[PDB]
Assembly symmetry: C3
Homo-oligomer: 375 residues x 3
């Protein structure tokens, strides 16, 4: 509970270098929660600690992505992307900025994080030494206050499933993207200062909610390996799934990449770090509204109404397939100038069905898709 | 005095490396005229020493931008952009390539530079230890010979206004763009061997010309932080202004940046390193021909006939506003294949008017705009 | 003899770093066959050992490009492009991925290479210490087995013609592209398990064939310096020519580059490392089907039916001009989504004629062109 490792960066006091930085090495069988760029970042480098929640029916969602990268220097802070959805369709969403990001590892092996702004507002996290619990405290004046908790209850420990090699931790060479907590039950108690029309509103998820945690980092900037991405975490009957799939920019010859994990009754049954042309592999196919009647489209040039997600087992014909349809729109922000080819990012409360061949379990997910106009 | 530090690069002998280099650190309250990549240029690094002049009436102009740029090296050497405009509208413009670029700092604190080619041809500059004077000598056989001088006569020294921090010296992280001489009186006496359809011309500005000097450098190549730029140096009654404004490419999330300086009869009255986001800030708005009748358009996809330039003073409602109209075309070169979306660069002898509330000064500027086909 | 230098890379074990690596320095008057990134590759770097063959009549072709390439590693391993063409027009072509790539230099000065996969399949090469002979062995289960030989019989040695400076070995700064064996006679005996309608077929090129060898490497990825390339090796009467000619992407301001060599009965008579507006220069002009009736087009947006290739002496005004027309299609693969601006790569068995003024020699070449969808 005394700090034994400490990284503290102040984006307003010269911690950005304009040439590449190599991160600290990946640690096998660790959740690698301590920053990999501990003293300085480059204009390219990024680190992500992400915690999302939603209730079992998908009527409410609350997510928080904490970043260290240089995108927010002009706003004076590291990014904290906070998004909330109520049962009535109201959405609250902001990129919040915090001049200081401090992450410590304590002697007991717990990890603490603190995004701190000059006015004293903060978002903090605290993660158990064995990665089975995470707690966030929000204290952002005039924006959002409250708490979020994620807990793993599975039989097999988080540690048992942690990547043992760089390949198992990687989206692609040099891009690390990991789901170290696996299946989590969630709870939220939060208050938002102004929602919809200048009014305060509270939000609750009770210890019975779903969600997921993401730990990611890279020296490589996103445009150099992707121009389209999809992320979701979901519960579909007894299945717990989590996936990031990128579609490459021209700088990786438009190659797709994915990191994906599938649990069944709390046990890992599929781990994929490759796309169907190591462990397993995944295929992710966009669904168009001329193919499937149910599902919203986002507001930009990507008109898909959902996806088909297939987990293919290495040895066999036995796999798992999930139909994902966009059920409720969360966030929506452009990533280019408007127009017929304008791109953007859209968050979703997904309706998902499927499982093994013949199965038709039904559940929900929380995630989002993004394009940026990189060739 | 003899040279006390010396940077000499020669395109025949390993002057460029295929991986990134961090420049030497920015020096506070210095003009930073000595090369920031003194032993070798990197795959993407560029350094700029620029000296532009025009006469009080805008009838003649003469500009020279000296580069150490990996792009120029790939194209033949250390390069100089040289552009002249005569009262009848004839333009002379060439990119000149040199095998050797040498910059020294001397014991007395002066800075000397020499772009030199095999055949003896050369462009040299000599800058005073206190940056109040700069002299160029042109001796390029069959192209141009003569001299250029800039002399600052302000009672407040150039050093007093020099950037004291990376913030004040930067367009954006790692991109340095500075106007260390401030307001200068200029003169030029040059002969050009062939102008128009046959024929030698002299070109003269009497010490009572206007213009300005630019010192810039970065490890980051221009396409990674911009795809559209406007630069101008101008005199408008008692005002002397200098501004670069970039609009970002996808690689900086389309963020706009600016470095701008406004002097009032020799004293700095507004310093901006930020764009207004609806030191001080600047707003730069393009003007289209359906809005304003007076002004030329460039020959490429950017159809604007000028700009509105506003300096917004921190905490005040009252700033300065300048109307910029494209009066005379200088240089015009494509930067993509031609077509409806073809990009290019255009130089201008802009007609500029305005000032603070109640002011209507009128003057001229020398500048240019540029697009490149990067999303 | 025993290895005195060894570089062995394994995709299971930290073979690629996510930040730039500088290669080992170019060695003057060496074929530089040992890997320039010997301990690991970077996420940008690539290295090429390429060996191509065709018969004198242009009825059959067999080529093998061996790579260590970050893009290939991202896509499965150290890759080999293997392409074959039979007299009836049947083409066989695959990209093969290998877990291990090993190159050694032995005490006798020979260079040995081994692309090796988990199942024991391999492609090996062995190159003589004076670069006059090279032999490849293919042992790829279910794909291809056999041998390819290249031998130089010129009275002037390969060593006499090797580049002596970084400039003579370069396409552009930092991109090395070399033809160290010069003119070679070739021989192939190969068997392919499945070609056309699932049928194995043998392929024979008697020690009376033509072809060429390429050795290239760079820390700079292809999109950052090109978006269109043409490569060919050919025999036209007593002439043996070899050229790469790239057209720049926006990241090198669309500048064209070339590396080209022309031999007359075994002696180097033109070495060009520059495009027509140091040694000589080359001009490479596309020919359109509205200009010339004979010649195929590729299947993508580049509709050319051939090229005009001119070698220009600096210190005279004669040179050599060759007419290149696409005779037979070898490989054809898209490099973008399909459509009116869809790009791709096309291999060809070229018909080539020409020479100096008053010459009309006729022969054949093996090569290809490619575009990548980078502005």
């Amino acid at each position: 509970s005394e700090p034994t490792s400490s990284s503290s960066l102040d984006i307003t006091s010269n911690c950005i270098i304009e040439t590449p930085l190599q991160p600290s090495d990946f640690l096998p069988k660790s959740a690698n929660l301590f920053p990999k760029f501990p003293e300085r970042i480059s204009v390219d480098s990024w680190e992500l600690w992400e915690f999302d929640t939603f209730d079992t029916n998908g009527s409410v969602a609350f997510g928080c992505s904490l970043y260290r990268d240089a995108r927010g220097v002009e706003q004076g802070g590291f990014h904290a992307e906070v998004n909330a959805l109520w049962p009535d369709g109201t959405h609250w969403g902001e990129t919040l900025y915090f001049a200081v990001s401090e992450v410590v590892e304590n002697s007991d092996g717990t990890t603490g994080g603190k995004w701190l702004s000059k006015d004293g507002g903060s978002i903090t996290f605290h993660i158990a030494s064995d990665y089975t619990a995470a707690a966030l405290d929000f204290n952002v004046p005039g924006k959002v206050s409250g708490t979020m908790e994620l807990r793993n209850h599975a039989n097999v420990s988080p540690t048992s499933n942690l990547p043992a090699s760089d390949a198992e931790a990687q989206l692609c060479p040099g891009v690390y993207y990991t789901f170290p907590m696996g299946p989590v039950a969630t709870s939220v108690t939060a208050t938002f200062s102004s929602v919809g029309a200048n009014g305060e509103s509270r939000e609750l998820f009770i210890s019975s909610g779903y969600g997921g945690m993401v730990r990611g980092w890279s020296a490589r900037p996103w445009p150099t390996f992707m121009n389209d991405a999809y992320y979701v975490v979901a519960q579909v009957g007894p299945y717990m799934l989590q996936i990031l799939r990128t579609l490459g920019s021209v700088f990786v010859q438009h190659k797709p990449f994915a990191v994906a994990r599938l649990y069944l009754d709390g046990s890992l049954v599929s781990a994929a770090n490759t796309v169907v042309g190591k462990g397993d592999a995944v295929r992710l196919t966009k669904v168009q509204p001329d193919e499937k009647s149910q599902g919203l489209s986002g507001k930009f040039r990507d008109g898909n109404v959902g996806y088909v997600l297939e987990f293919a087992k290495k040895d066999s014909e036995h796999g798992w397939t999930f139909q994902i349809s966009h059920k409720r729109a969360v966030w929506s922000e452009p990533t280019s100038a408007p127009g017929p080819d304008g791109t953007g990012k859209s968050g979703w409360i997904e309706a998902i069905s499927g499982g093994a061949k013949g199965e038709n379990y039904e559940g929900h997910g929380f995630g989002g898709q993004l394009q940026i106009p990189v060739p």
